Protein backbone atom coordinates (compact mmCIF):
# COMPACT_ATOMS: atom_id res chain seq x y z
CA UNK A 1 0.00 0.00 0.00
CA UNK A 2 2.99 2.26 0.63
CA UNK A 3 3.81 2.08 -3.08
CA UNK A 4 0.08 2.15 -3.94
CA UNK A 5 -0.26 5.48 -2.09
CA UNK A 6 2.65 7.16 -3.89
CA UNK A 7 1.60 5.80 -7.29
CA UNK A 8 -2.03 6.93 -6.97
CA UNK A 9 -0.70 10.31 -5.85
CA UNK A 10 1.26 10.30 -9.11
CA UNK A 11 -1.98 9.58 -10.98
CA UNK A 12 -4.04 12.33 -9.32
CA UNK A 13 -1.46 15.03 -8.56
CA UNK A 14 0.53 15.45 -11.79
CA UNK A 15 -1.97 15.27 -14.69
CA UNK A 16 -4.28 17.73 -12.92
CA UNK A 17 -1.49 20.32 -13.08
CA UNK A 18 -0.76 19.46 -16.74
CA UNK A 19 -4.29 20.23 -17.96
CA UNK A 20 -4.43 23.84 -16.65
CA UNK A 21 -0.86 24.67 -17.67
CA UNK A 22 -1.82 23.41 -21.14
CA UNK A 23 -4.77 25.82 -21.21
CA UNK A 24 -2.53 28.60 -19.90
CA UNK A 25 -0.07 27.95 -22.74
CA UNK A 26 -2.99 28.01 -25.20
CA UNK A 27 -4.07 31.45 -23.91
CA UNK A 28 -0.43 32.62 -23.89
CA UNK A 29 -0.01 31.77 -27.58
CA UNK A 30 -3.44 33.23 -28.42
CA UNK A 31 -2.49 36.55 -26.80
CA UNK A 32 0.98 36.49 -28.42
CA UNK A 33 -0.43 35.91 -31.91
CA UNK A 34 -3.22 38.49 -31.65
CA UNK A 35 -0.70 40.91 -30.13
CA UNK A 36 1.59 40.59 -33.12
CA UNK A 37 -1.23 40.80 -35.69
CA UNK A 38 -2.87 43.90 -34.22
CA UNK A 39 0.46 45.57 -33.41
CA UNK A 40 1.52 45.19 -37.05
CA UNK A 41 -1.86 46.61 -38.11
CA UNK B 1 14.00 -1.28 -9.98
CA UNK B 2 10.52 -0.22 -11.09
CA UNK B 3 9.67 1.09 -7.62
CA UNK B 4 12.83 3.21 -7.43
CA UNK B 5 12.54 4.95 -10.80
CA UNK B 6 8.75 5.41 -10.75
CA UNK B 7 8.64 6.69 -7.16
CA UNK B 8 11.59 9.08 -7.56
CA UNK B 9 10.22 10.25 -10.92
CA UNK B 10 6.91 11.13 -9.25
CA UNK B 11 8.62 13.71 -7.01
CA UNK B 12 11.19 14.96 -9.51
CA UNK B 13 8.81 15.22 -12.47
CA UNK B 14 6.08 16.91 -10.40
CA UNK B 15 8.56 19.54 -9.16
CA UNK B 16 9.67 19.94 -12.79
CA UNK B 17 6.05 20.57 -13.77
CA UNK B 18 5.59 23.16 -11.00
CA UNK B 19 8.55 25.39 -11.85
CA UNK B 20 7.76 26.05 -15.55
CA UNK B 21 4.08 26.86 -15.07
CA UNK B 22 4.78 29.55 -12.47
CA UNK B 23 7.45 31.13 -14.67
CA UNK B 24 5.16 30.86 -17.71
CA UNK B 25 2.35 32.74 -15.98
CA UNK B 26 4.70 35.40 -14.60
CA UNK B 27 6.33 36.12 -17.97
CA UNK B 28 3.14 36.08 -20.04
CA UNK B 29 1.10 38.13 -17.58
CA UNK B 30 3.77 40.85 -17.69
CA UNK B 31 3.61 40.53 -21.49
CA UNK B 32 -0.15 41.23 -21.35
CA UNK B 33 0.66 44.58 -19.71
CA UNK B 34 3.21 45.34 -22.42
CA UNK B 35 0.66 44.45 -25.10
CA UNK B 36 -2.04 46.72 -23.75
CA UNK B 37 0.31 49.68 -23.21
CA UNK B 38 1.70 49.51 -26.75
CA UNK B 39 -1.68 48.84 -28.38
CA UNK B 40 -3.41 51.85 -26.82
CA UNK B 41 -0.41 54.17 -27.28
Amino acid sequence: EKFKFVLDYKIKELKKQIEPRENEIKVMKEQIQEMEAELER
Amino acid sequence: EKFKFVLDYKIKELKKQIEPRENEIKVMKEQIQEMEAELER
Binding site: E34, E38, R41 | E36, L39, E40
Partner: peptide, 16 residues
Protein backbone atom coordinates in the same frame (compact mmCIF):
# COMPACT_ATOMS: atom_id res chain seq x y z
CA UNK C 1 -10.72 46.74 -33.46
CA UNK C 2 -9.06 45.20 -30.41
CA UNK C 3 -8.46 48.62 -28.85
CA UNK C 4 -12.07 49.52 -29.65
CA UNK C 5 -13.13 46.37 -27.80
CA UNK C 6 -10.92 47.60 -24.95
CA UNK C 7 -12.91 50.85 -25.16
CA UNK C 8 -16.01 48.68 -24.73
CA UNK C 9 -14.37 47.13 -21.66
CA UNK C 10 -13.59 50.59 -20.24
CA UNK C 11 -17.17 51.70 -20.93
CA UNK C 12 -18.53 48.69 -19.05
CA UNK C 13 -16.16 49.49 -16.17
CA UNK C 14 -17.57 53.02 -15.85
CA UNK C 15 -21.12 51.68 -16.16
CA UNK C 16 -20.26 49.30 -13.31
Amino acid sequence: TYTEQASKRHHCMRLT
